[PDB]
Design a protein around this ligand. Structure first.
Ligand SMILES: *[C@@H]1O[C@H](CO)[C@@H](O[C@@H]2O[C@H](CO)[C@@H](O[C@@H]3O[C@H](CO)[C@@H](O)[C@H](O[C@@H]4O[C@H](CO)[C@@H](O)[C@H](O)[C@@H]4O)[C@@H]3O)[C@H](O)[C@H]2NC(C)=O)[C@H](O)[C@H]1NC(C)=O
Ligand SMILES: *[C@@H]1O[C@H](CO)[C@@H](O[C@@H]2O[C@H](CO)[C@@H](O)[C@H](O)[C@H]2NC(C)=O)[C@H](O)[C@H]1NC(C)=O
Ligand SMILES: *[C@@H]1O[C@H](CO)[C@@H](O)[C@H](O)[C@H]1NC(C)=O
Length: 407
């Protein structure tokens, strides 16, 4: 529950780590964003400069915190480090989860229903096994993560298909193939899943009479018909250092806003992407002022889908993915120490139009399946701009991306 005190909810898991109440929530937002930034940069490195990039970093943190609940030692420590939970001012590693839940409460349970922002988590564990009873309870109590019994052992590729359809249902059709083909096997014990959906209407619309098809040129040497939108109004805006523009497009309500970032034409995104931090982002935010301006942005849809393994390994999640060293003895009943994350996937969808925006994303951590290779199917394109959908009052980057192809 959201309306509760720190001691009230007995959320003491197995392990623990070292290292008014509203300020906890806020410290976790700083943590989350630091992860978000860093995760973004590593992920950027993996991709081309001209490739699209979209994701919910909030989603990832959530799914990995869910996982954290049955972690121990060199798995629990790394989890806190990598996801900057070891930054929040509190001495115990089980205190993260009370605040994450409260953050989640603020995010997904508001009276202000200008824009729709929902989330659904769920554990899908093998049917034959028994899961630690405290584990289970906290999972559902803190995150809302019910445990659904699927037949990993026998009917494997249909349970892969049932988790995907579950995500699909919770993301209004947008997120369809979270779990890639052939990743859930006969040994798959548990699959931890997050889901976030957003849909907002602009605070000020783009009339559809003013949209114009104009052609877009890629770095390879190709053309596509972009659909530019147009509008004129007062918008929080700033031309910052190096001739970079930061424009903010608030949604009906003012609580959630889309924040664009475009570099001076000559320059690339790289410089800005390489120096991108939470501090940097808030600087610009504080700088912005109300301005009469003409906005031209595309009518477009981007979808991004990837594994988090290599990237997260790079930032320090090494034990968790390791078959020999991974430490997760709070999940099942006996302490099965053959629990290790095979692979973890993410998939996001962005759609911006005249009427507003729709964003969806999902994260699925898979315990003991296979670890497949990055399945890449995307093309490079020119002149990219960063997008960020954020919740103002609670300092959280919900979605975050780099649009690079508006067709
Ligand atoms: C994801 O799965 C959800 C269930 O867990 C499911 O949501 C439920 O869907 C039904 C839709 O049939 C919702 O019920 C609606 O309730 C109102 C009651 O006021 C009805 O008016 C409405 O029926 C429509 O109304 C007409 C009758 O005047 C009829 O002619 C129309 O054709 C139509 O049937 C529904 O009965 C229910 O509230 C939903 N929520 C829950 C929690 O159950 C989702 O559809 C599914 N989403 C996706 C994307 O798959
Ligand atoms: C489920 O996990 C809990 C902790 O995550 C385990 O219980 C703890 O066990 C130690 C002693 O063995 C006690 O000091 C703690 O107070 C226990 N917690 C509770 C709530 O009992 C528990 O052993 C696990 N259960 C199973 C079946 O494995
Ligand atoms: C891991 O942590 C538990 C308690 O936190 C401790 O008992 C154990 O010795 C640690 N090390 C290993 C290798 O398990």
């Amino acid at each position: 529950i959201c309306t509760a005190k720190p001691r009230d909810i007995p959320m003491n898991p197995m392990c623990i780590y070292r290292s008014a109440t509203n300020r906890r929530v806020w410290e976790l937002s700083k943590a989350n964003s630091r992860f978000a930034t860093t995760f973004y940069q590593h992920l950027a490195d993996s991709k081309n400069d001209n490739d699209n990039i979209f994701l919910s970093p909030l989603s990832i943190s959530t799914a990995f915190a869910m996982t954290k609940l049955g972690a121990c030692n060199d798995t629990l420590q790394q989890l806190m480090e990598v996801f900057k939970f070891d930054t929040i001012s509190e001495k115990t590693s089980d205190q993260i989860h009370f605040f994450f839940a409260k953050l989640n409460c603020r995010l997904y349970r508001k009276a202000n229903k200008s824009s729709k922002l929902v989330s659904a988590n769920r554990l899908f564990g093998d049917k034959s096994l028994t899961f630690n009873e405290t584990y289970q309870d906290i999972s559902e109590l803190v995150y809302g993560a019910k445990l659904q019994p699927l037949d990993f052992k026998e009917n494997a590729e249909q349970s892969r298909a049932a988790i995907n359809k579950w995500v699909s249902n919770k993301t209004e059709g947008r997120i369809t193939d979270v779990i890639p083909s052939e990743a859930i096997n006969e040994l798959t014990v548990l699959v931890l899943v997050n889901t976030i959906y957003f849909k907002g209407l602009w605070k000020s619309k783009f009339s559809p009479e003013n949209t114009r098809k104009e052609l877009f040129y890629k770095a390879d040497g190709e053309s596509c018909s972009a659909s530019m939108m147009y509008q004129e109004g007062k918008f929080r805006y700033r031309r910052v250092a190096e001739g970079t523009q930061v424009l903010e497009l608030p949604f009906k309500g003012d609580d959630i806003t889309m924040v664009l970032i475009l570099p001076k034409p000559e320059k690339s995104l790289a410089k800005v992407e390489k120096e991108l931090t939470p501090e940097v982002l808030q600087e610009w935010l504080d700088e912005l002022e109300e301005m009469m301006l003409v906005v031209h942005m595309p009518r477009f849809r981007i979808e991004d889908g990837f594994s988090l393994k290599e990237q997260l390994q790079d930032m320090g999640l090494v034990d968790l993915f390791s078959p020999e060293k991974s430490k997760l003895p709070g999940i099942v009943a006996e302490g099965r120490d053959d629990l290790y994350v095979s692979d973890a996937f993410h998939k996001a969808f962005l759609e911006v139009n005249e009427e507003g925006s729709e964003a969806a994303a999902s994260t699925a951590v898979v315990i003991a399946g296979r670890s497949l290779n990055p399945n890449r199917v995307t093309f490079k394109a020119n002149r990219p701009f960063l997008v960020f959908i954020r919740e103002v009052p609670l300092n959280t980057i919900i979605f975050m991306g780099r649009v690079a192809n508006p067709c």
